[PDB]
Amino acid sequence: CTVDVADRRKRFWTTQIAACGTSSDDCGDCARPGLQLMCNGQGQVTVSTDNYAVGLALNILLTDASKADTGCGWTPGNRGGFWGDSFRSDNLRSGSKIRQVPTRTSMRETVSLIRAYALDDLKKLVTYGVAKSVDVDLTYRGSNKIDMTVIIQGVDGNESRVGLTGERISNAWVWS
Amino acid sequence: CNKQNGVKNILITFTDCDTQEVIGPISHEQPDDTLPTYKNCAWTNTALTNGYVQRSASNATMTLPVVRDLRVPLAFYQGCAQVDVQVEKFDGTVMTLTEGAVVEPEESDGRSVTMNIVASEIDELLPPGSL
Amino acid sequence: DALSDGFVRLCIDPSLNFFGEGCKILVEGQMTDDGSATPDAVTCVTSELDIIERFGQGSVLTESLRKVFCTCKSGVSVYALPREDAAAGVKAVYTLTIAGPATTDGRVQLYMGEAEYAVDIGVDAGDTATDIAAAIVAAISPDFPYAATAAAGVITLTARNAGTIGNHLSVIYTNLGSCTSVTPEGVTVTFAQTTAGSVNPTPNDYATVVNECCFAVYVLSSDDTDWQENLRDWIRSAWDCSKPQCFGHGYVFNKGTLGQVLADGDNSAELSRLALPTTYPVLPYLTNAAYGALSACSTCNNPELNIQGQTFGLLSCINMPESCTPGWTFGEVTQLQANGFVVSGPSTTSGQGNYTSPYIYNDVTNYLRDEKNRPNATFRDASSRRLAAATGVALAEFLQQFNGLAVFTKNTNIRTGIIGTNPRLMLGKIRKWAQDNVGTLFSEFDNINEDIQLLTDFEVQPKCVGQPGIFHLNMRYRPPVRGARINVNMAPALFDNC
Amino acid sequence: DNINEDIQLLTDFEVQPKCVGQPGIFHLNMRYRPPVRGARINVNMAPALFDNC
Amino acid sequence: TTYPVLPYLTNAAYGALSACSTCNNPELNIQGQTFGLLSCINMPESCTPGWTFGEVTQLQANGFVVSGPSTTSGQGNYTSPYIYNDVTNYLRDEKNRPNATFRDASSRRLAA
Hints:
By secondary structure, chain A is α+β, with helices and mostly antiparallel strands. In chain A, 18% of the residues lie in helices and 10% in strands.
């Protein structure tokens, strides 16, 4: 009984930044995310399950969404997306489309376009009920360099504040 | 001296719109004897009846007749760039204005421009000693 | 990747924590010998899973760090400064005597330190005191800052860190001498405090350890007033006019009776004393570190936020059972408010027992007099200090556009085409920047005509001593004011007349 | 990048040495760059458990 | 004495910068966070910054160029150095008198 206060809900494997190490290519150092294997005292490895929200954000940013219908067409196998979206019930798509920007001159317009796309795609974190106020701060024009820091606002696993305007996220058990 | 109604210094700082490159503050000079004119009060009154007033909202306005610099494109003086203006008269007053917006462009032969700039508020410096 | 399709190529930053790295908090305290950290050297702490192996199990610092992590999970990067125990330190030893034998079953509950170290065991009838003590010692939390042993029903708690930080546990909350619905009938306890505190580390080497490595919030987990005075001297040196500043603020505590607390304070404008009564349940450095971490990680980009009140100044990681007397009596509370002392009190009115959570009133610094002994209130509020720092950085960042700009004094007649300026124009621009930040950095003003002065070096130094290009910007401001002092004059009127 | 010093049109009378140029000949120097495509965004993802509105 | 970067590297970087940014504009000093930034030199971060401020001002006084970091970011990554006081080693005049006519290098390029 009284023990109750701890959800029996668990978390599955989570993709993590720099799980497979950096990859230098003389332009900089990338992250190459993947799955982190946590070892034990006596063999018995196990996949890690931390940073759930960042895991969803990586799953969203780093997967191509469906392309838009053009008169040119697409190769049967290049039109992006996931067939598993045919079975979900929330009536949404899976992935992002930052890599589908219609490039143009005057890189300020390209920056604004990428901002719009990244924000529209990351809003699915709030729509799923995992964060509350995800937001981006994409600001640069350089030659082509761009910085795109992302903030994923979260909660705790026990409602400690009374009288909020919104409504507790539906999945505040991941701790966001 | 301090007894001469006239403009002494005009500094204009241009900010390109699509590159955010700051240019200036370049000095500037008048094309003729007409001086720049100002208006600071944001709310503008209007008469109503026996003694009362109806109050409207407006901008801090400035009219600046200036001679185009041959190093700056003409379009910078006609609403295609953000401007920061600073005018110092001979009696000591200094009017600064930042984040302006040239609001009403008009045809100019290529030398003399008349910029109509609107901002949120204009700052006034008032020679030492003031009530 | 070559296999990719489009052209926009994202390059994820190697790791997260970007939005921090600007709110560094240095937690200072002692560590045990189990730890693998090099003493007397600042070293950051990323996560909570590796403080026990780095700073030893159950040490003083290993729990300050735990409270700093519990308080706010992200937003800051914490740096631990471990300090080795003193050479001639004698660990403080407490004795806890248990007398049986029990006659009816029940539960034995004890509250040592805070709620995280609480213990709760089951006791059958006919059990002897030796078995009760053995069970207690077998269920005592291993992170408790006291190695616990048992012998013939007598429990000995030996402080894991040698020094006077072992003398701050004197109020244990048992469940054995009452009528609670679970009570081994025939079991009593006794608190002893056999040995006593000792000599404390007095390092005084902050210059060498951290010199130009600017921090935001220093937390001290010790009560030796000389160590607090060394920390105050460091933070005061950091706000100097000689070297470029690394603004900061420090958090210490001072536990004892009213006179002792009023005696430990001074005009140290850089610290924030936390007055704690003699019978405080929580180990003092725990609540000190909770307050320090909350202050450090809520006021990163909001430097005007005052940390005081039941919402913004709540210490959620602290859970105390209430007491008969309210610790500080109201008279003593006001006495402490007056002499720049922070006071913490319980939020809910829950009655005896009945866990609660302390919060902070008057988030103020220990600054009550000025230079030349003239009383003030400029640096009393702890937000006024953060706003002084922010005003400095913002003004100095704004003034950068005049670097290398041609300056025309003695003629103030910049020609047509030059990109120069003169002191009147610089003063105009600065005055506009100032009256532009009214409401975010400054109060309204009092007289902006003579509050802000821009003089040229050629008219301050004596004749033929000034240098060309040097300037002098003298500003006088007031941080944004808050609240009012309205005076009501309520008066009825039975007669009427309209 | 800077169209003022990217396009130059000089006359042959001022390129060759004196009394060597011919009338009518010009010299057009242009320095260009083909249209650029794509970007090099640097994501800096970081969560935030605390909240201070 | 504890400089991490090989000396001639930063010396040549400073020399090239001062030659590719001033030869068409012989008035601006190689100085400050924007102009005097040696982007090709990368040092590891550190909190003890070589010259203490006392030594720094002592060197500024005796006509020496001093260099510091540009981020002092504790322990996260490399940072580019940065020069102060783009000056020359001209303390006192030819007779013996002290004067600053040839103190900063832009005065030299301007005289030329």
